Design a protein around this ligand. Structure first.
Ligand SMILES: Nc1nc2c(ncn2[C@@H]2O[C@H](COP(=O)(O)OP(=O)(O)O)[C@@H](O)[C@H]2O)c(=O)[nH]1
Ligand SMILES: Nc1nc2c(ncn2[C@@H]2O[C@H](COP(=O)(O)OP(=O)(O)O)[C@@H](O)[C@H]2O)c(=O)[nH]1
Lengths: 47, 277, 185, 93, 126, 430, 430
């Protein structure tokens, strides 16, 4: 449910047990409790 | 009704009884056997009269050391680094009571040990560790006999003292661990006597700083000089100051130790300063 | 303080013998102690200033920080025994240009440094008992190029045994000193 | 029967601050029941073993502690209280 | 030497200090200092009374041993008494090294002059 | 300005469950704890009853205490039970047995330190603390004993706050427990010293509310506890919403209590009306005032016609003019002047709040201080004297350890309270 | 700056297996050795623990030593076991017999040369060598004896590098082995001379962590080894990821150890919390600090309330503010000031790292140097003195060849360690 840098992804996780409402809850909570407006290590992610 | 005298610091002290359980007996051994919820009124009636000048009196009870409210005025218990400890039993007492020792006390204004056999022929391997084991005693006549015999044996010994050094470390360490300041002073004085009594002894004691010197660190700051400022102390003759004794003993150990005693002493006591370089 | 006194020959303000040796001195002692003890080498009473921190434990003169000694004699002589440890002392003087200057000597200094307020210098002590003769006028002339008028503060730091501190108007030989000033082994 | 539980104190600010704000040092004595505009109430908690005697001792200690003090109040657990005042203002004892 | 109702012993010293000693091991529990050598200890249901050689009588409370003074008297031959010119509410007396001024209506005293080691003989008002 | 609630015993826990349902509904909190409300006005004062948890969640500032967990297990299993913080449930291992001495002395002192620890943890977390609110019955065992124990401890620890209680009291006609007079007398003795303001409810009065006013065919304890939850949430409504004339628990106490022992009040709530009748009467301030003073709508067995009002307070919810409120309170005081104590020039305080409860156009809650409460205490004291002369069931209480002097003191103090009410009822200017 | 790991004995091999699972997961290495990670930050410091093989594969710089191959066959069969280089498994042909003297003198000197050859081959391959890391138990036989032998040899060959150990120590309540006091005393004697830093863990503390905090119904050694792998991987985190305030093993040693013998530390790890409770409390710096200092969560039997802190260290992982860290560590130091040694003005060092452990938003590991460790050594010395005075099992050790004087030396050295701790606890400013 999280990447290496500790963020909560964007899209639905495959075979996830939680519903969409709790996913939106977790996303908004994590955006509330962040200390910076963006990840300072975005450029080092690969896919 | 009954009265209880203070009875402290006197001829009859129960303090000296708890330590060294073997003491207290006569010249011979022990004698043969045969010789609810009561009402207390209305304490408070403040209801209906609340006001801002009131504030809480109870404020719960006690405090936990690492809770949210805090530790309050609580303090941890003392470890007792300076608390006096029990004196282990000594081989000197057994050998003296049994009757194998060739010395006896000669009374007088300056006490002196009368020796029934010439000292130079004694087997120091058997005797020197036994006498150092008697330094720990705190009851007459064991104290004077043991310590004066130690001094006499060291003074007249000669070249045979040197191989005895490995056997003397345990009595030296056990004397210092008792945390009795007078025993510490006697041990330090005898150590000062031992260091210079012969040759190549200081170099032999360098590997054994790991066992002796730990007790030096604890007592290097204790001082009896309670006089204020420039007042002189008239009890200097007794040499009962622990700190001066331990400092001068450390300096003597450095001087007679040899090439690399300083690093070992520095590793044992941290606040030391070199006396040579 | 000594401004209105008679100042000629020898003027001494410290002496271990007496009812109140530290009468005109103030003590600032932490992690240390000061006391009067009998010395083994010379068999007489001496003062001892010993502490774990050199800077913290010291004795000053005069007691009130706003007072000045006002002594015009050029030389300062000390009687100090070295204990193979750290030791330092200070003297504050006044020149004819009206500037208060300090002279600090310590046995662990490496290089001499001269500044408009301070001149730090190394100092070495021989084994046993030592007498240190200090020339304020020569040091002032050599350091600042300015004449010397008076001293107005004396300090002493741990660790060192002391018997007497006195001023003199010139150097004296061993036999020219009065008996009470000369030390005997 | 009842025992004291707290004591209340009314004090004035220090003399230099009172002069800085602009209020006169004198003319504090008056026959009216009203108080100075800068007098503040503070309260303290007594311990369990406290009685009338040591509470009064604490009040006297507060009286001799600092300048700018004429009012006192000792509160009991029954809700009652009594007041202590200086007979002569700006004069202790 | 006077015993309290509880059983403890009171003491009085020549320096003027009053202490309370325990009946078990004779250790100090409470102490008060008053002026004058203590000669006489009394017992009252709410406190104690202490009398001194300088004719001072104090009243102390057994709760926590605080002292207050209610008596002032001379202790030697009184030499002279005078009145001021035109005033009668107060008068001055001399005795030993002391000069005192009393209030005639209430028998109180508010003044004292002491020169130790001397004797006053005659006093007059300007 | 936040209140902390305590619920004790079976009655207290059951009433509390309905109260927290009503409060969660008014602020739009889902039983999962998620905010689902429909106006910002709901959120901006949510702190008054809820504490804020980190994520999407809210937690209620309440301590639950009981001696056997059966009630707690039933409420925790209920539909809103999840909202409560698990650490807030404090319980023992054996019941109070409806005995005051057991509840006060043996298991009370065993639990009370853990209850005080939870109450202190909750209190010291507040940025500014308002009074405590406690619900319990007086006839029970753990409710009476541990409630009054905790009240006494909180009054020692927080003497400057307000202490408010809601309390259930024995009906005059049928007992629910054989030993009610002892437990009631001892609890009233404790309360009159400790409490600042106390409201009393008879289950018999709620039965008469249900049968006469709402004409319910098959009422259940959920309805009685809903009526109670309605009045309790109504008294505090002005604390937590805007209005034209704000009011506060301390200001209510200052206006209601003339003397510190006279702090026992009657309660009522007005827009009660049967499903058949609502077509016959539109809401208006005169109608609310008429229901407000009708003894049919009052939650105690004593009737106002045998006593006099010292003071009363009315809190109005809804959009309304101040002129009709003021003039209605004047007209009621003028028309019924013999029932109002004459040495007070105006007995009624009014307050107005803009936001009514959902689905009602307007509402008022009524609090009344009337001397007719003395007859209830007189009846309880009579039954106590009847039981004590014969030492009725006394061995249980004496076997736990109580001194009989406690019983004689509590009876004497309550008897002096009835006498004091009777003297002020018949007082005159002269 | 690369570390070489050594795992010795059964406990060491199992903890090592769980550690290398945790580390391979954190850097996204498949158990086949293929990199499958999702950020460059994972790759850029892989050298610290891994050596590079030619194709996909990476190999971990670790030596496994044991006297009977049963454990090695179990770890090779484990889920990450395949990753280990076959030549790195060193084993003998007969067991340690749970005897320290046997493990140190007879099979130790027989095997040690092949272990030293492997350790040198691994060390001399590094471009710059950082400290060694060793895992073993002190109560066992080959773990204690051969581990301390190898430590002494490595300290002879690399005296300027760092030597770090994690060590398992006997519980105060139940023994797993009868001869534990001898093996523990001799091992502590070896460690206090040879080691730079030694961490001690009680299995009893891990059981209490699991049962009270995690509420596991049936915990297993896999859970205990996960807790250990968590702290072990936390200490090294600043070596291998970026951060706002970098830290290093040497900087930890320099700030934690006031004097060279006082290098034994207690451990804890903070964000432990049950799945049921997690919904009620979000992670934040106050919560982590409060849990971090609660003695319930600390991994030693000694309790801080009986001692005083000389120094402490906290390593934080995650994106977080420095202000909150500084003000919390100040507030904790101020409120409990009697439990902190007064001749050091601030006892706690902080450090902050950007990259948390996978699946946690934030974490902290705590290292503490506390005098209450003296109680453990005193207890071990007591049990040793009870056995030695009676020669309880000494003939086994003497038959291997040990002189009795070694036991008295080791006892004396531990007793002096206890005395030194006691003296520094009661020191004062004067
Ligand atoms: N109104 C109301 N009264 C109740 C409720 N539950 C119990 N009671 C009453 O409270 C009294 C019993 O007290 P109880 O709560 O059992 O005391 P406890 O055993 O100490 O908890 C009886 O008069 C019951 O009728 C309830 O939910 N609502
Ligand atoms: N924490 C932990 N302790 C263990 C583990 N395996 C064994 N122990 C403990 O270590 C001690 C046994 O030592 P052992 O490793 O068998 O010594 P060896 O025979 O020399 O390898 C006992 O106290 C066991 O409880 C493990 O996986 N984790």
């Amino acid at each position: 449910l999280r990447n290496s840098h500790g963020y909560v992804h964007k899209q639905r996780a495959l075979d996830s047990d939680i519903d969409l409402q709790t996913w939106r809850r977790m996303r908004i909570i994590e955006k509330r409790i962040d200390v910076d407006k963006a990840d300072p290590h975005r450029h080092k992610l690969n896919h | 009704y009954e009265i209880q005298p203070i009875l402290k610091g006197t001829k009859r002290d129960p303090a000296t009884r708890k330590y060294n359980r073997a003491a207290g007996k006569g010249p011979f051994g022990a004698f043969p056997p045969g010789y609810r919820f009561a009402y207390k009124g209305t304490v408070q009636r403040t209801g209906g009269t609340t006001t801002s000048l009131y504030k809480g009196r109870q404020q719960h009870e006690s405090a936990v050391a690492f809770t949210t409210n805090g530790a309050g005025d609580s303090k941890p218990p003392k470890a007792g680094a300076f608390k006096r400890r029990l004196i282990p039993p000594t081989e000197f007492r057994r050998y003296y009571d049994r009757g194998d020792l060739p010395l006896s006390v000669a009374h007088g204004n300056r006490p002196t040990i009368d020796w029934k056999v010439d000292v130079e022929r004694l087997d120091y391997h058997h005797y020197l560790p036994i006498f150092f084991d008697g330094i720990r005693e705190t009851e007459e006549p064991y104290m004077f006999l043991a310590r004066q015999g130690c001094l006499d044996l060291l003074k007249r010994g000669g070249p045979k003292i040197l191989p005895t050094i490995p056997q003397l470390i345990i009595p030296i360490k056990t004397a210092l661990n008792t945390r009795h300041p007078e025993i510490i002073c006697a041990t330090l004085r005898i150590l000062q006597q031992l260091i210079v009594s012969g040759d190549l002894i200081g170099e032999a004691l360098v590997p054994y700083y790991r066992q002796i010197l730990p007790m030096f660190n604890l007592f290097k700051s204790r001082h009896k000089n309670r006089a204020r400022g420039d007042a002189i102390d008239f009890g200097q003759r007794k040499r009962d100051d622990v700190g001066d004794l331990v400092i001068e003993t450390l300096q003597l150990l450095e001087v007679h130790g040899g090439d690399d005693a300083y690093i070992n002493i520095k590793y044992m006591v941290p606040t030391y300063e070199s006396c040579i370089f | 303080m000594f401004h209105n006194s008679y100042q000629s020959g020898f003027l001494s303000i410290l002496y271990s013998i007496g009812s109140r040796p530290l009468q005109i001195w103030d003590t600032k002692v932490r992690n240390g102690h000061v006391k009067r003890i009998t010395d083994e080498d010379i068999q007489s009473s001496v003062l001892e200033v010993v502490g774990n921190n050199v800077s913290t434990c010291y004795i000053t003169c005069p007691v009130d920080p706003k007072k000045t000694l006002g002594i015009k004699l050029p030389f300062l002589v000390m009687i100090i025994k070295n204990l193979k440890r750290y030791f330092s002392f200070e003297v504050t003087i006044l020149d004819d240009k009206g500037i208060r200057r300090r002279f600090r000597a310590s046995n662990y200094q490496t290089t001499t440094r001269v500044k408009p307020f301070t001149c730090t210098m190394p100092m070495r002590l021989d084994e046993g008992w030592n007498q240190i003769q200090f020339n304020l006028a020569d040091f002032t002339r050599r350091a600042y190029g300015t004449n010397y008028l008076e001293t107005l503060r004396v300090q002493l730091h741990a660790n060192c045994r002391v018997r007497r501190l006195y001023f003199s108007d010139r150097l004296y030989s061993e036999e020219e000193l009065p008996p009470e000033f000369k030390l005997f082994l | 029967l009842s025992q004291p539980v707290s004591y209340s104190l009314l004090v004035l600010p220090p003399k230099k601050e009172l002069r800085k704000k602009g209020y006169n040092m004198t003319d504090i004595n008056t026959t009216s029941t009203r108080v100075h505009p800068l007098a503040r109430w503070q309260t303290h908690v007594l311990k369990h073993g406290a009685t009338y005697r040591d509470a009064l001792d604490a009040v006297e200690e507060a009286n001799t502690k600092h300048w700018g003090f004429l009012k006192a109040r000792i509160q009991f657990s029954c809700g009652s209280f009594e007041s202590f005042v200086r007979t002569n203002p700006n004069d202790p004892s | 030497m006077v015993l309290d109702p509880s059983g403890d012993v009171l003491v009085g010293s020549g320096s003027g200090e009053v202490a309370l000693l325990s009946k078990i091991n004779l250790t100090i529990l409470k102490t008060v200092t008053v002026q004058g050598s203590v000669t006489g200890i009394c017992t009252v249901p709410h406190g104690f009374l202490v009398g001194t050689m300088s004719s001072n009588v104090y009243l102390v409370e057994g709760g926590n041993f605080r002292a207050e003074l209610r008596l002032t008297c001379h202790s030697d031959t009184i030499n002279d008494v005078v009145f001021p010119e035109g005033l009668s509410a107060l008068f001055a007396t001399c005795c030993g090294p002391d000069i005192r001024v009393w209030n005639a209506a209430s028998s109180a005293e508010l003044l004292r002059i002491e020169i130790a080691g001397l004797t006053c003989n005659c006093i007059q008002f300007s | 300005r936040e209140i902390v609630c305590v619920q004790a015993g079976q009655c207290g826990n059951q009433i509390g469950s309905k109260f927290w349902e009503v409060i969660s509904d008014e602020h739009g909190v889902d039983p999962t704890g998620t905010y689902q409300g429909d106006s910002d006005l709901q959120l901006e004062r949510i702190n008054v009853y809820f504490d804020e948890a980190t994520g999407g969640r809210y937690v209620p500032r309440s301590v639950l205490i009981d001696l056997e967990p059966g009630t707690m297990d039933s409420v925790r299993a209920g539909p809103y039970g999840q909202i409560f913080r698990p650490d807030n449930f404090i319980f023992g291992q054996s019941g109070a047995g409806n005995n005051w001495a057991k509840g006060h002395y043996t298991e009370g002192a065993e639990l009370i330190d853990s209850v005080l620890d939870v109450c202190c943890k909750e209190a010291e977390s507040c940025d500014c603390l308002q009074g405590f609110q406690i619900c319990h019955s007086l006839g029970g065992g753990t409710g009476s004993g541990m409630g009054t124990l905790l009240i006494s401890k909180l009054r020692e620890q927080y003497p400057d706050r307000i202490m408010m209680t809601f309390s259930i009291i024995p009906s005059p006609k049928v007992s629910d427990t054989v030993v009610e007079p002892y437990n009631t007398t001892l609890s009233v003795h404790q309360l009159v010293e400790n409490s600042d303001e106390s409201m009393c409810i008879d289950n018999e009065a709620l039965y008469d509310i249900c049968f006469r006013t709402l004409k319910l065919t098959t009422p259940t304890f959920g309805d009685l506890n809903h009526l109670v939850s309605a009045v309790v949430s109504g008294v505090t409504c002005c604390l937590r919403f805007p209005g034209q004339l704000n009011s506060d628990l301390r200001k209510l106490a200052v206006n209601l209590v003339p003397f510190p022992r006279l702090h026992f009040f009657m309660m009522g709530f007005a827009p009660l009306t049967s499903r058949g009748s609502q077509q016959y009467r539109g809401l208006s301030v005169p109608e609310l005032t008429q229901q407000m003073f009708d003894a049919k709508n009052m939650m105690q067995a004593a009737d106002p016609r045998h006593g006099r009002y010292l003071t009363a307070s009315a809190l109005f919810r809804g959009r309304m003019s101040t002129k009709e409120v003021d003039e209605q309170m004047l007209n009621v005081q003028n028309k019924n002047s013999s029932y109002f104590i004459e040495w007070i020039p105006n007995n009624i305080k009014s307050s107005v709040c803009d936001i009514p409860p959902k689905g009602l156009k307007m509402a008022v809650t009524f609090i009344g201080n009337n001397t007719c409460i003395q007859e209830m205490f007189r009846r309880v004291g009579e039954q106590f004297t009847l039981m004590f002369r014969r030492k009725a069931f006394l061995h249980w209480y004496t076997g736990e350890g109580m001194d009989e002097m406690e019983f004689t003191e509590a009876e004497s103090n309550m008897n002096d309270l009835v006498s004091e009410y009777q003297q002020y009822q018949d007082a005159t200017i002269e």
